[PDB]
Design a protein. Structure first.
Ligand SMILES: Cn1c(=O)n(C2CCOCC2)c2c3cc(-c4cccnc4)ccc3ncc21
Length: 802
């Protein structure tokens, strides 16, 4: 009756929030309760007119390469209604001024040109100008905002030393327990139990007295229990709870097994109980509830020493002297926003006094607030190394400066960063709740970015599910309708992918596929595309649908577009795959999209193709089909072969000369990008190219060479084992490489988090690849040398690949 809505949300999320069986406290229920207010606040504050039409706009400057297309200076936008007419408009002209009521929707898209924004500052206008396409719009009627209607004793006096009683470890099928007090990645104090023979049950009943006191336990503290026999099981328990109270009583904790990592920081217990390892522990209880309460300059030499510490890379660890230097002169270090991550590492979190000294130091934020926004440091303070609620919130406060365009560039990386938050309700989760609820595009990607983890991560599904339910409860009836239509389709397409895979390691398979898709089309008739929400896919082209030939078996699906106002009847091609982890490809594609923005600021377009890719469920998702594209393997199935393929598929010579240029930029782009990320040693079948000349890597799901610059690519430029194109390539390569190096800290910390949340020494790769330390001229030469490593090898490495 009154519960029907929750069972609808339950099916959208893919996990039950009301079901509380793997919970030892009430944090999820308390954060479900606490999340109501920032949803109520956002639902109410959003302009219902601009919420319904979600104009995807930017406040960033129009790039160098895009002002080349505009001349007079005017742009042509063709308005449709059967009868169409072109209108010459100034780049700085508002959409209403063009209209001279009615709205300017994009043809075949739920994309609109609205608000007090210049047309040059629209993401669809910039997109068309980049791709050299016409701006086809339609004089449509604004959508009803009615469709989005939303349904409605003190701690610092407990000077006693802390202790935990290790009762034992009950397991269904030598060993010792390692008890740790943790804050960030920094272990405060360790204690082990005496080794005992490994059996079905191992009792100890011994108390482990720690060096740290109750008073000195920081908000965010963790009792991390580990089972060593060398590490085999782990579990965590927040010593300070959500209601600021120290943990008391008996706790049985089901432990996570093994095979550093974000999964190893989780406060959640293992849901499996009949097969998992447990741990009975006792925590000292009291009659009254224990509750946590709330100059000189610097000499020229010690200034230079501190300046060198700030200027180093994030991965560079601080010594004991570096930590003392930074802490003593914290008031100076506070006047340099770049020192904050390193300074907040230098503080002794296991000392109530040193913590209180930081908390009051942070009240002098006049300098941090007034600073120019840096995503680098903001992401730095949100990682595993920072467990303090206050420090993290200073980073979340800067995320408010980010306009909807930028929130989209880091939505996935911010969603992952929630894994490092000690408590469920956090400034970050709330931040992602505001931005998702304010914007429909952000909200759509939020849904899928959260649903990605809820369905595959047993470690963080609990936390993420309460954040999804909170977003869902405020998006409005329209988005809730759209998501049911997406869930219903992917859940339908999930069975088909799995049933077909359970028939192969042919005509039988291809007939059985259409035999199943037939009893599927007879709901829904339309659904938004999870990786491109503007595009609405209609009914299937069941005759075009096939099962793909590789080691894995994906579903090549083609859907007609639901919008009849579309320019072409070109179907929407979607790959539905199983057995591969799309969570890592999502992460790689995101850094690629970030790299492009870095190049945009530096006035460069390296023509990357970061194809839509959404992780949907348990090792299953969907991938965008790139139209008129094939792999290098299919083009070979040597030197001449690619340039012969480009001319052959090219209509005019004008278009071919465009095809070789689109090749040099995209090739240089994938050369710099895949090198930095360390995914350049890839097989020919994992490198694609459009009939337009647009090259792009794929299958990112986890002798040597730095990148792929084979002779067939070189022959396209006009070189065999210099050229006017190869010189243009080398120059744009360096120009692109040096741009990414200006954002070292950003890339370093983006990669670091990517590793921990998606997948110590492995991370160190970007230090060397982004040539940390070396000057602008030394890096130019270093990259040009890596070009020559590909020239020397040629077909060697490509041949080596089995
Ligand atoms: C025409 N055509 C293909 O043949 N294929 C492939 C199918 C699987 O064998 C490799 C080639 C693709 C595409 C494959 C991906 C992709 C698939 C899995 C992982 N990462 C990326 C993306 C876009 C694509 N577009 C077009 C297209």
């Amino acid at each position: 009756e009154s519960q029907a809505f929750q069972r609808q949300l339950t099916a959208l999320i893919g996990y039950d929030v009301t079901d509380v069986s793997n919970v030892h406290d009430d944090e999820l229920e308390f954060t479900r309760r606490g999340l109501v207010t920032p949803r109520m606040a956002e639902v109410a504050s959003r302009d219902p007119k601009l919420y319904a039409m979600h104009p995807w706009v930017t406040s960033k400057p129009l790039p160098e390469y895009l002002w080349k297309k505009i001349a007079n200076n005017c742009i042509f936008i063709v308005i449709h209604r059967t009868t169409s007419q072109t209108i010459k408009v100034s780049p700085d002209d508002t959409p209403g001024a063009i209209l001279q009521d009615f709205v300017l929707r994009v043809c075949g898209r739920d994309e609109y040109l609205v608000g007090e924004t210049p047309i040059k500052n629209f993401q669809w206008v910039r997109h068309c100008l980049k791709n050299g396409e016409e701006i086809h719009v339609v004089l449509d009627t604004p959508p009803d905002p009615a469709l989005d209607e939303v349904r409605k004793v003190s701690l610092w006096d407990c000077d006693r030393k802390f202790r935990v009683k290790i009762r034992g470890i009950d397991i269904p099928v030598t060993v010792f327990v390692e008890a740790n007090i943790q804050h960030g990645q920094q272990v405060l104090c360790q204690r082990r139990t005496s080794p005992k023979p490994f059996t079905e049950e191992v009792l100890w009943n011994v108390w482990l007295e720690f060096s740290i006191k109750i008073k000195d336990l920081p908000k965010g503290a963790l009792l991390n229990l580990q089972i060593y026999c060398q590490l085999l099981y782990y579990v965590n328990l927040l010593l300070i709870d959500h209601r600021f109270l120290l943990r008391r009583g008996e706790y049985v904790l089901h432990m996570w097994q093994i095979s550093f990592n974000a999964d190893k920081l989780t406060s959640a217990t293992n849901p499996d109980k009949e097969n998992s390892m447990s741990i009975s522990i006792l925590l000292d209880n009291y009659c009254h509830p224990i509750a946590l309460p709330k100059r000189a300059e610097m000499p020229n030499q010690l200034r230079k020493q501190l300046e060198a510490i700030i200027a180093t890379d994030p991965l560079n660890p601080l010594t004991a002297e570096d930590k003392e230097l930074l802490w003593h002169f914290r008031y100076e270090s506070l006047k340099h926003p770049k020192a904050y991550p390193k300074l907040f590492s230098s503080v002794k979190w296991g000392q109530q006094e040193i913590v209180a000294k930081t908390y009051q130091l942070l009240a002098r934020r006049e300098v941090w607030d007034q600073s120019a926004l840096d995503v680098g440091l903001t992401m730095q303070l949100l990682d595993c190394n920072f467990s303090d609620e206050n420090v993290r919130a200073i980073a979340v406060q800067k995320l408010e400066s980010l306009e909807d365009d930028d929130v989209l560039h880091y939505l996935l990386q911010l969603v992952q960063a929630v894994k490092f938050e000690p408590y469920h309700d956090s400034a970050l989760a709330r931040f992602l709740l505001k931005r998702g609820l304010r914007n429909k595009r952000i909200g759509h990607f939020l849904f899928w970015f959260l649903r990605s983890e809820i369905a595959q991560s047993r470690h963080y599904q609990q936390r993420f599910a309460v954040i999804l339910e909170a977003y869902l409860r405020g998006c409005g009836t329209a988005m809730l309708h759209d998501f049911t239509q997406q869930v219903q389709v992917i859940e339908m397409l999930q069975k088909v992918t799995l049933d077909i895979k359970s028939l192969s390691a042919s005509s039988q398979v291809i007939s059985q596929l259409k035999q199943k898709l037939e009893n599927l089309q007879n709901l829904p008739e339309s659904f938004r595309v999870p990786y491109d929400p503007g595009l609405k896919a209609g009914a299937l082209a069941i005759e075009k649908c096939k099962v793909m030939a590789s080691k894995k078996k994906p579903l090549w699906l083609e859907f007609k577009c639901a919008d009849p106002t579309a320019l072409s009847n070109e179907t929407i091609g979607i790959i539905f795959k199983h057995g591969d982890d799309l969570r890592q490809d999502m992460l790689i594609l995101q850094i690629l999209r970030i790299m492009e923005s870095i190049w945009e600021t530096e006035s460069l377009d390296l023509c990357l193709l970061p194809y839509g890719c959404i992780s949907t469920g348990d090792k299953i998702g969907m991938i965008e089909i790139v139209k008129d594209a094939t792999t290098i393997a299919k083009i070979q199935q040597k030197d001449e072969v690619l340039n012969h393929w480009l001319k052959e598929k090219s209509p005019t010579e004008e278009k071919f000369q465009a095809a070789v240029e689109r090749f040099v930029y995209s090739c240089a782009g994938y050369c710099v990008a895949t090198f930095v990320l360390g995914i350049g040693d890839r097989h020919n079948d994992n490198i694609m190219i459009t009939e337009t000349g647009n090259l792009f890597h794929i299958d990112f799901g986890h002798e040597r060479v730095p990148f792929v610059l084979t002779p067939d690519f070189l022959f396209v430029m006009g070189t065999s084992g210099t050229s006017p194109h190869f010189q243009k390539f080398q120059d744009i390569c360096v120009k692109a490489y040096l741009a990414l190096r200006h954002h070292t800290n950003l890339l370093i910390i983006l990669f670091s988090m990517m590793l921990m949340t998606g997948m110590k020494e492995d991370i160190e790769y970007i230090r060397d690849a982004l040539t940390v330390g070396k000057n602008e001229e030394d890096a130019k030469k270093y990259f040009l040398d890596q070009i020559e490593v590909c020239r020397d090898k040629g077909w060697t490495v490509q041949f080596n690949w089995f």
